[PDB]
Structure 1
Amino acid sequence: KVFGRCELAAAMKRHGLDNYRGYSLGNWVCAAKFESNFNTQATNRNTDGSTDYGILQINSRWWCNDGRTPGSRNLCNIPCSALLSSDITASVNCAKKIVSDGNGMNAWVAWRNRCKGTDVQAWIRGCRL
């Protein structure tokens, strides 16, 4: 599925991401835009043999198990295939674990390069929440 901007904002709000661990909702919408272009099926392969899955590009070395990544830790205790669903619930629940791990949203390269430091509340402007 490809989400619209406000559609995703609303879905993320219903799953408790607004101000979660100190990050307002606009951070999460911005991260999803530049990580996956709002596409739940985005995947990206890495030089360490890991793959990033889904709308928040969750990595298979640390967080989900894809059965092909050496050194997998599976800290979200979830198969990576579940993160390619059109329903964002599994991705959100894993994202909540990632941000609680101890470096916040810095786990998302596209967020720290392209969202951090800008007025991210513009990403939820004009949405009914």
Structure 2
Amino acid sequence: KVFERCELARTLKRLGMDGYRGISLANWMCLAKWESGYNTRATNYNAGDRSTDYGIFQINSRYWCNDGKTPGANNACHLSCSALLQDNIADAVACAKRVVRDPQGIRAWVAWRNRCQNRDVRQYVQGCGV
């Protein structure tokens, strides 16, 4: 599913993402936007290390979900990577929260550093009623 901007902003808010571990909803929007274009089916194979990024947040198989084909990988969210390809984002949100409970927080995603950190992210939630 490819979410519309405000549709996702409200979906994330209902799932408890607004200010989770100090991360505003607009940051989460900027992350999903740049990671997948708000697309839950998004996937990116990393030929260099044999891992794959899954879903709207592009969570990597090396550490967060199990896909059975990533060498010496871990499954910190204890989910099948398939769970991150659902139209319903509940599991992806639970896993996104898991990622940020780690030291780096939102900085875990290099795309967030590249396109969201120290930027005006207000535009992502403007007019969404969140």
TM-score of the superposition, structure 2-length normalised? 0.97
Determine if contact 1:60/1:69 at 8 Å carries over to the other structure.
Answer: yes
- Equivalent position of 1:54 in the other structure: 55
> Which residue of the partner structure matches residue 7 of structure 1?
7
**Identity over aligned residues, as a percent?**
60
- Kept in 2, the 8 Å contact 1:25–1:121? The answer is no
Deviation track 1:94-118 (CA, whole Å, cap 9, x = no partner) reads: 0001001110111112111001111
The offset of 1:92, in angstroms, is 0.2
Where does 1:41-120 land on structure 2 (aligned, <5 Å)? 41-46=41-46, 47-120=48-121
SS in 2 for 1:3: coil
Find the counterpart in structure 1 of residue 38 from structure 2: 38
2:64 counterpart letter in structure 1? W
C-alpha separation in 2, matches of 1:100 and 1:118: 23
Consecutive unaligned residues of structure 1, counting only runs of 5 or more, are: none
**Alignment size in residue pairs:** 129
Describe the superposition over 1:58-90 as per-residue Cα deviations: whole angstroms up to 9, x where unpaired.
Answer: 000000000000111100000000100000000
Give the C-alpha shift of residue 121 in structure 1: 2.1
Q: Classify the secondary structure of the residue corresponding to 1:51.
A: strand
Other structure's SS at 1:126 match? coil
Aligned partners of 1:77 and 1:58: how far apart in 2? 13
CA contact under 8 A between 1:53 and 1:80: conserved in structure 2? yes
1:21 offset after TM fit, Å? 0.6
Runs (4 or more) in structure 1 with deviation over 6 Å come to none
Distance 1:106 1:51 in 2: 19
| CA distance in 1: counterparts of 2:125 and 2:71, whole angstroms | 38
- The letter for the 1-side match of 2:32 is A
Q: Distance in 2 between matches of 1:127 and 1:8?
A: 9
TM-fit CA distance, 1:55: 0.2
**Residue type of the alignment partner of 2:11:** A
